[PDB]
């Protein structure tokens, strides 16, 4: 679980980089789909499943909107993300194993974009956080 140290760490980072959440999400989704092309099956209903395609760019804003909401609900992610979980679980049926793949891509993007901010210490707490995010998103699956 996240310590008070972790939460502060994640709120302070987000406080600094949230301004770029649209680009972080565009970039993170593009990476997932290119580096882990098997995940494109969940997006195959889009006409352009290419990096920075208008569908990818748009959805990128939603994902990082969900990540902004997870920071906001960081003290109780299960409750906070319950609706997003139900979405991914019963409407979309996304294998929860994929959450850690996007999470890894989010870490890669943030490092490329905010190298001086994304310190070992920021990294360990964000990692723990993204892991809690995946766990809450898995809530409604079984």
């Amino acid at each position: 679980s996240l310590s008070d140290k972790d939460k502060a760490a994640v709120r302070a980072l987000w406080s600094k980089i949230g301004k770029s959440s649209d680009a972080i999400g565009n970039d993170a989704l593009s990476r997932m789909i290119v580096v882990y092309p098997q995940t494109k099956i969940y997006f195959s209903h889009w006409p352009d499943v290419t990096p920075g395609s208008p569908n990818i760019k748009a959805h990128g804003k939603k994902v990082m909107g969900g990540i902004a909401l997870a920071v906001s609900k960081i003290d109780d992610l299960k409750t906070g993300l319950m609706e997003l979980s139900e979405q991914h679980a019963y409407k979309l049926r996304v294998d929860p194993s994929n959450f850690k793949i996007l999470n890894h891509c989010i870490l890669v993007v943030i490092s490329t974009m905010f190298p001086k901010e994304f310190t070992p210490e920021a990294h360990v707490s964000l990692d723990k956080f993204l892991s809690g995010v995946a766990l809450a998103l898995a809530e409604r699956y079984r």
Binding site: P37, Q38, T39, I41, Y42, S44, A89, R93, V94, D95, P96, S97, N98, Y141, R142
Partner: protein
Amino acid sequence: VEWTDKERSIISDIFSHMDYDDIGPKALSRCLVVYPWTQRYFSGFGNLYNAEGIMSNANVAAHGIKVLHGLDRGMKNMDNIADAYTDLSTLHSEKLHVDPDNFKLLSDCITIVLAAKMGHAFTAETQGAFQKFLAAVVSALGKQYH
């Protein structure tokens, strides 16, 4: 993956004594209950689960028999696993859009259902060779995912 003779014997031995008409359906039925998102690929068959929540559709379950016969091929020529499964890989990826992670989940179900049947004959070394074989098929099935 290379194979010792003992591993080859173990895998051959497992499949010769395996009742595919039993193991197969039980394993897919179990995976649809333990990893429910997998029902996404069968959803169109309809009438999938019990009021009681069990995946009672024999038809869908019967796909587990085809999986096990799909395993025959790797088993028949264990030195050619990777090339053995290209058309199957192509099919689950390009036509079925199946998440490859689901291959791992079903394998796990197969191992446990097999475990229940063989009982104390499913030794540690048997589980070992059988997991190693499943792993190699799984990997080969995710190759045509592009």
